[PDB]
Scaffold this active site. Structure first.
Site, mmCIF file in Angstrom:
data_model
loop_
_atom_site.group_PDB
_atom_site.id
_atom_site.type_symbol
_atom_site.label_atom_id
_atom_site.label_comp_id
_atom_site.label_asym_id
_atom_site.label_seq_id
_atom_site.Cartn_x
_atom_site.Cartn_y
_atom_site.Cartn_z
ATOM 1 N N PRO A 1 0.807 -1.235 0.000
ATOM 2 C CG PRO A 1 -0.102 -1.113 2.127
ATOM 3 C CD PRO A 1 0.462 -2.092 1.148
ATOM 4 C CB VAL B 1 -5.155 2.888 -3.061
ATOM 5 C CG1 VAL B 1 -5.467 2.066 -4.302
ATOM 6 C CG2 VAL B 1 -6.205 3.969 -2.854
ATOM 7 C CB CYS B 2 -1.636 4.364 0.668
ATOM 8 S SG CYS B 2 -0.623 2.904 1.005
ATOM 9 N N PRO B 3 -4.484 5.842 1.776
ATOM 10 C CG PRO B 3 -4.936 6.614 3.979
ATOM 11 C CD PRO B 3 -4.567 5.375 3.234
#
EC number: 1.11.1.24
Lengths: 175, 173, 175, 177, 172, 170, 178, 175, 170, 178
Positions: free
Chosen positions: G174, H51-53
């Protein structure tokens, strides 16, 4: 006629315009030049050589017999003009043909031999053809031999005469 | 497979019904391998020009037998037309019984293949072809339809190859 | 030789087995024959051509040198094996090429002047050429020169000497 | 010329327009520039080749002999104008060509060596080709010495000078000059 | 109709132009000569057969019985017009066909035998066909009989009569 | 014969498989079935039509003469099998036809009537075609009429008897 | 991969065999030689030019860093191996390239650039492509820039070490970290 | 630009017209619209994708840094405009995107990704590409990232601010 | 069935294997697992649609209804499984459809949509389709409405209700 | 519809012209005839078929309900013109459909069944088709059932009105209302 056809009896003959040897000098000879007469062409294997050109000596020595009676004799070879000219030019001990009374043509791009369906593609020479052309540019008579057997000048001659006469008259002698 | 009979090449094989002495017999170019053949075309069954060349043509048989050659006529006329045109007497324009085979090319394969066929008119031409014992065509004549060919030319030209092919050697000159 | 192409430097020369007049006889000659030697191929004018006395004689004079230095020349032209013979027999004083010490390689079916792309089919004539061919069959020096020029015998033997040196040993010479 | 004919003598030479190094600066060279005046187009195999540079120097010395006769010398190779310009800009004595009196060509796109038939496809370089081009843009001479042999400038000169004879005379001279 | 077609019922008959024998004189009978009339097109293959062609003499002798209804009789074969003329001058006793009042078309190039599709290309002859062509040139009818027997005379009258009555009155 | 070809005198008869009314009931009839008797294959335009019945009754009534001489009679049309069967039920007074003794083949997808090329495609109907097939699968006779006139009863029978003799004798 | 195809991510990378300048001597570089390592394949337009393009230097120093991280750097151009060789033997201060620790490939016959689609046909040079090709011979990343601007080497190393990591773990990350 | 080629460097950008979600409404975006500006085309993997914020928010957040040098930013994906709509409404806080100030180019028949060659034939999503286009319509830079590496605001912009100036100068730039 | 056909009743609807939303998660469904049962495939215009949630909740509500007759309900759309999954997890206040009891397939790469011939290449969406696949793999029924009208579920498996009894089963 | 398309939703309805049995006599029916109305076209396999003709009776007796809305019903089968004639002259007790209120088109050359692809080509028959056609001649609904199950008329009507209503305001209706 179109370009791309091989000569076929009863059909328009392929035209030419070619360099030629006439009585020891260079001249441009075409079929249109002779339109109004009949034109006889005969083929041979090789210049400046044996095979005993019985028929060529016959026609050329018989040229006169063709001229008055209404025929035009023409020879041909796949040589250039210089070989044919030199071979009429030189004497007989040098292997010459001597001077001759008929027009000779040099087909050095092969166009003629290709046109009339004679040329042997592998050997770059011609079988023995005899073709007769009329004043409208149509081929009345064709004979072809292998290269071990000769011609008959008198057969061609009388046949010429006959076709000539019968064209105007439209009849043919019986039997 | 347009064969297109041409000089100094194998003769196209053909098989055609023909008259041999007033009887139906199948004639192919196969029979005579080992013997010369002269294949001659005539314009028409019962033509209008003249009979008495034709009577002279049909008469010459032995002359090609002496020097070892076979004579054959062919036409795009039917086998029957040729037969009946042997059965009619010469007085009426016919022939009578004759010693030469008369080949029927009605189907147009033979004459087409030797290039003497007029495709529009479906009639033969003045053709003459010489085939050597090994199958090579050594001679061809073509005249326009109206004037006949000559038996003497054929007779001469066959024996030229008789002697010359026979020797196996070049000749002076 | 692909049954195709025309002619190109490097890639192996088109092979041929035809005929030639070697010293007045017809020896059956193939380029296959000369494997193990260099072969220099040279094309010549038509028979009975129009040229000066000096140029032609030169290459007949150097004819022996190729035989000496380890190489074989092939004269050739689109001319005929018999006509060329006629043009050696006829001596120089009478206008003939005279005797030549190299083969005259006869192409009358155009094969030789065709593989090498020198023939303009319109004229039936071959343009001048020099092809250096190694024992391996690889075409290396290409020369199309053109009709009018002398075939330079010093450039031809320069080529024989030098090329043969560079493939025979392998070191070039600078500059 | 039709778009992909490989050059053949007596026929209109393939026209080109290409980047070239002339006198240390970039310039475009094309057939059309030179019109009637003859052109000698010669190819060189490689920039910074281990081969002797001398082949090149003589050409310059002969350029003037081509000029007095109304002719022009040209050079070409598949090397880019930076490789060729780098190969002129280094002194003759240090391994480069130094300055010269004759144009070059950058064939970096490999059009010429094809259209003129001097190309080795796998190596992307030029042979020793020499082309002699006429006033009407006709190729009457070509010579290819392979890659192991350079050319002969006195030969080429006789050939230019000597074809002017046949041209302006309208005749072929077996022995004349 | 494009050229190259084979005869098809209820469609324009393939056009043809031939030489034909009429009372011992050459004539160009073509096709169009007969517009406005039914056209009886019959093929008789190569002649000179043992079997008796007596049926054709029934047509020839009855041809005045036919013609009154507005029909033109034509036969054909692949012989030459000189060949046909020879088999026409040969009397019937000796194996010929002497008298005829109907034209005989000679099509040896096969255009006629090939264009209406009665042909054996390898035999250069037809089967025994008959095509009845109305005044518009349309093929209304096709008969094909094998080589062993022949065709039938009264049938042609029955059908031509039928198509006269039906084409005239509209009732079938 | 090859598929896609059209039939003709002297050539092999195309095989087919079609629904047919036999003495009042459906059956799958194929040409290969009847090999060994002559077969008269004819066509007729349409079901519940007008000229057809008086013509059809002729050959249908002759079933015993063709089964005596060793023959089999068939008509075919582009109408649906149902239309033929109902037709067979509709009685000649009110009916188109009456019950009949000869098999009838309905080609509703039109492929069969294509096969022998008697079909008039634009109209999707068939002329009165007449074909005579022998035990070897060869058509010895063909007749193609237009729709306005029937063929004949006597001509087919006379022809089958005629060709039998030459087949066996000479 | 088949002859004539264009380089595309996720598909087998076209192999290569080329004359190359390796430490002053000629060496032919092939793809099968590096199987088991990544290969970073890069292109440069022309030898002996101006504007001292530093992307190359960056891929050299970074080539040390790749081999530390177990990757292999390769350039190439359609300049001939004599031009390239002369330009490696040429000190930098004169406009040359100075010494280099990465193989430099000669595309002289234009076979490679046509297969990775970086070739300019009419101008006869190669674009700036960047292809990371794994031991399996697959292209996971593509960077093409106009010839005028240099690549960012730092990103090259970032992501390279990246896909070796994600390949080991078999799952995406991520948030990238270093 | 000819239909069927898949983009290229230096080559005209493929024209397209595709419904886009902009600030909660639908608008037709064609690249012709932005002639006179730079335009950036980036592809996001999906809507509601994991997904990464922080990474996603920062890229969206900078449309001011693009505007300040006069440039337009555009994202895209293969999803329908309604899914991306729901994703611009759905707050980031919930695991979504949240409101976004740059248009969202969604193509559900896939045309856009096909013309720009980022269409993965068997998936139906595009990798992370970002393309730079100038006030002409020529493609000055192309980046195709793999789906696992997001973009870099500084790497996407730096080249933009660099092309503005390198083009603007119209002069050669020293080493 | 051929590779490259579209779909035709009785030509056996093209299979597939495709990622599906099942009861809130992803699960891999093909048109295989349901061999032996009928399957009803139906397409919906969009995910997160602004149109009519009520009919949609009513559609999903019928599952046991097809299980009792031995039938399986699947739906399909061009929305991704990550796009379509989020559309079951959302409440009505945001436009959400709610959690539903029947599988929903995402055909994002268009393979199916094109296969069954309901796809519109321009719009990139599928019209509301309906297909009934029998245990023997043969398409027994297809209905395609335009986008403006949904499906009467009664029209959905009424036909199935008929096919069960046509099979006779005993 | 370019003449050689097959029936497809939203594309021009294929033109066709046929002889038909309408009220005990023949007639020529064309699509051209009705322009300005919708048309609902249904197929049935064959004449005197022993599946129940309840599907046909349904629309036929209902013909006026497909009228007042400004629509027109059409039946088609592969039968001839006298096949449909004979099939209208049997009362229902006999297996026939007797007199009819709707045009019954006879396609015996298949042009209609081939145009819309509802032909069973090997058997030269028809499945049960139902198609909805607009005044502008475009097919907005198609249903194919196997031979074993009929076509509900009421469902079909339900599909008939809505398209009219929405074409008039150009507004879609979220939740359907009879």
């Amino acid at each position: 006629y179109f370009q791309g056809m091989v000569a076929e009896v009863q059909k328009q003959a392929p035209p030419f315009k070619k360099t030629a040897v006439v009585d020891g000098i260079f001249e441009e000879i075409s079929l249109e030049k002779y339109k109004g007469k009949y034109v006889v062409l005969a083929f041979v294997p090789l210049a400046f050589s044996f095979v005993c050109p019985t028929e060529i000596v016959a026609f050329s020595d018989a040229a006169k017999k063709f001229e008055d009676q209404g025929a035009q004799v023409l020879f041909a070879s796949t040589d250039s003009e210089y070989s044919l000219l030199a071979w009429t030019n030189l004497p007989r001990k040098d292997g010459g043909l001597g001077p001759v009374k008929v027009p000779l043509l040099a087909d050095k791009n092969h166009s003629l031999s290709r046109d009339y369906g004679v040329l042997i593609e592998k050997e770059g020479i011609a079988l023995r053809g005899l073709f007769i052309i009329d004043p409208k540019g149509i081929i009345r008579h064709i004979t072809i031999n292998d290269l071990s057997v000769g011609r008959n000048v008198n057969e061609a001659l009388r046949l010429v005469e006959g076709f000539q006469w019968t064209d105007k008259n439209g009849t043919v002698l019986p039997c």
